[PDB]
Write a protein that holds these residues in place. Structure first.
Motif, PDB file in Angstrom:
ATOM      1  N   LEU A 197       2.704  11.418   7.433  1.00 54.34           N
ATOM      2  CA  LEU A 197       1.198  11.098   6.900  1.00 54.34           C
ATOM      3  C   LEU A 197       1.364   9.816   6.293  1.00 54.34           C
ATOM      4  CD1 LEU A 197      -1.555  12.557   6.409  1.00 54.34           C
ATOM      5  CD2 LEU A 197      -0.397  12.795   3.816  1.00 54.34           C
ATOM      6  N   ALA A 198       2.057   9.660   5.668  1.00 54.43           N
ATOM      7  CA  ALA A 198       1.992   8.157   5.070  1.00 54.43           C
ATOM      8  C   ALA A 198       3.361   7.364   5.543  1.00 54.43           C
ATOM      9  CB  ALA A 198       2.070   8.352   3.372  1.00 54.43           C
ATOM     10  N   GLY A 205       0.739  -1.190   0.019  1.00 54.24           N
ATOM     11  CA  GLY A 205      -0.035  -0.043  -0.089  1.00 54.24           C
ATOM     12  C   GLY A 205       0.875   1.297   0.100  1.00 54.24           C
ATOM     13  N   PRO A 206       0.400   2.378  -0.654  1.00 50.67           N
ATOM     14  CA  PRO A 206       0.944   3.710  -0.713  1.00 50.67           C
ATOM     15  C   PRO A 206       1.353   4.302   0.673  1.00 50.67           C
ATOM     16  CG  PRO A 206      -1.275   3.932  -1.400  1.00 50.67           C
ATOM     17  CD  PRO A 206      -0.978   2.390  -1.158  1.00 50.67           C
ATOM     18  N   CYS A 232       7.031   0.337   1.335  1.00 49.25           N
ATOM     19  CA  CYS A 232       6.743   1.720   0.679  1.00 49.25           C
ATOM     20  C   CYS A 232       7.680   2.944   1.028  1.00 49.25           C
ATOM     21  CB  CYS A 232       5.263   2.122   1.227  1.00 49.25           C
ATOM     22  SG  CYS A 232       5.095   2.642   3.025  1.00 49.25           S
ATOM     23  N   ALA A 233       8.706   2.437   1.723  1.00 47.38           N
ATOM     24  CA  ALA A 233       9.611   3.770   2.236  1.00 47.38           C
ATOM     25  C   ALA A 233      10.152   4.196   0.875  1.00 47.38           C
ATOM     26  CB  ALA A 233      10.748   3.032   3.069  1.00 47.38           C
ATOM     27  N   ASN A 234      10.324   5.740   0.993  1.00 42.75           N
ATOM     28  CA  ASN A 234      10.783   6.197  -0.269  1.00 42.75           C
ATOM     29  C   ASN A 234      10.857   7.687  -0.122  1.00 42.75           C
ATOM     30  OD1 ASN A 234       9.753   6.512  -3.727  1.00 42.75           O
ATOM     31  ND2 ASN A 234      11.681   6.672  -2.742  1.00 42.75           N
ATOM     32  N   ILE A 278       7.926   2.471  12.138  1.00 43.26           N
ATOM     33  CA  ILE A 278       7.615   3.550  11.204  1.00 43.26           C
ATOM     34  C   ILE A 278       6.286   3.312  10.747  1.00 43.26           C
ATOM     35  CG2 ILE A 278       7.878   4.850   8.867  1.00 43.26           C
ATOM     36  CD1 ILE A 278      10.822   4.250   9.044  1.00 43.26           C
ATOM     37  N   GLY A 279       5.471   4.275  10.805  1.00 46.95           N
ATOM     38  CA  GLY A 279       4.136   3.915  10.610  1.00 46.95           C
ATOM     39  C   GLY A 279       3.570   5.208   9.810  1.00 46.95           C
ATOM     40  N   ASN A 280       2.068   5.490   9.563  1.00 41.42           N
ATOM     41  CA  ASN A 280       1.270   6.531   8.996  1.00 41.42           C
ATOM     42  C   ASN A 280       0.759   7.373  10.149  1.00 41.42           C
ATOM     43  OD1 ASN A 280      -1.034   5.127   9.396  1.00 41.42           O
ATOM     44  ND2 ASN A 280      -0.685   4.095   7.335  1.00 41.42           N
TER      45      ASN A 280
END
Length: 156
Positions: free
Chosen positions: A91-92, A1-2, A126-128, A16-18
Motif C-alpha cells: 500500500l505505502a 513522505g510516509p 520511508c522503508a520501515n 519498491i513503490g506504493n
C-alpha cells in the motif's frame, strides 16, 4: 513522505513503490517494469504487459511473510536474471514490500537484515518494516538466510 515519492530503484532491475506507483503506466514504462510483486490485502493481477506475483498479506506483526520469502525471491531473481525489472509494492511501500525486498537482498549478498534495510533506505527512505517483520527478518538472518543463499547459488 510516509508513502514515498514514487517507485525507487533499490538494485538494478528492482524497485519498491506504493499502490499508486504500481498503476503509473509512464513510471512503469520509464523503469521498464515488466514484473510486479504485489503484497497487500487486495493483491491481484491488474495491468497488461506485466507478470504478477500477488501475495495477500496484511501489514501486521502477526502476518507471516517469511513463508513468502522463497517464492518472492524466485520471482524477483528470475526476473532480474532475464535482464528485466521488477516492482515490489504494497500500500505505502513502507513495510510489506520492503520486507520481501530485504529478504531478497540478504540472499544475494552477505548482508544481514539491517544492512539490507540500509540498502533499501538509500533508495527509499520511508522503508520501515513493522516490528513483527523485523523480528521475522532477524530470525531469517539467524537461522535461514545462509540456507537461502546456497539455494539460489545452486538453483541459478
Amino acid at each position: 513522505g510516509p508513502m514515498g515519492n514514487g517507485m525507487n530503484k533499490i538494485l538494478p532491475g528492482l524497485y519498491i513503490g506504493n499502490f499508486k506507483d504500481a498503476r503509473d503506466a509512464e513510471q512503469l514504462s520509464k523503469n521498464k517494469v515488466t514484473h510486479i510483486l504485489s503484497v497487500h490485502d487486495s493483491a491481484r493481477p491488474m495491468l497488461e504487459g506485466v507478470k504478477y506475483l500477488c501475495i495477500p498479506a496484511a501489514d501486521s506483526p502477526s502476518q507471516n511473510l517469511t513463508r513468502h520469502f522463497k517464492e518472492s525471491i524466485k520471482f524477483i531473481h528470475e526476473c532480474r536474471l532475464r535482464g528485466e525489472s521488477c516492482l515490489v509494492h504494497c500500500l505505502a511501500g513502507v513495510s510489506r514490500s520492503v520486507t520481501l525486498v530485504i529478504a531478497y537482498i540478504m540472499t544475494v549478498t552477505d548482508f544481514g537484515w539491517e544492512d539490507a534495510l540500509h540498502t533499501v533506505r538509500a533508495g527509499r527512505s520511508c522503508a520501515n518494516p513493522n516490528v513483527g517483520f523485523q523480528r521475522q527478518l532477524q530470525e531469517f538472518e539467524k537461522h535461514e538466510v545462509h540456507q537461502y543463499r546456497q539455494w539460489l547459488k545452486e538453483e541459478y
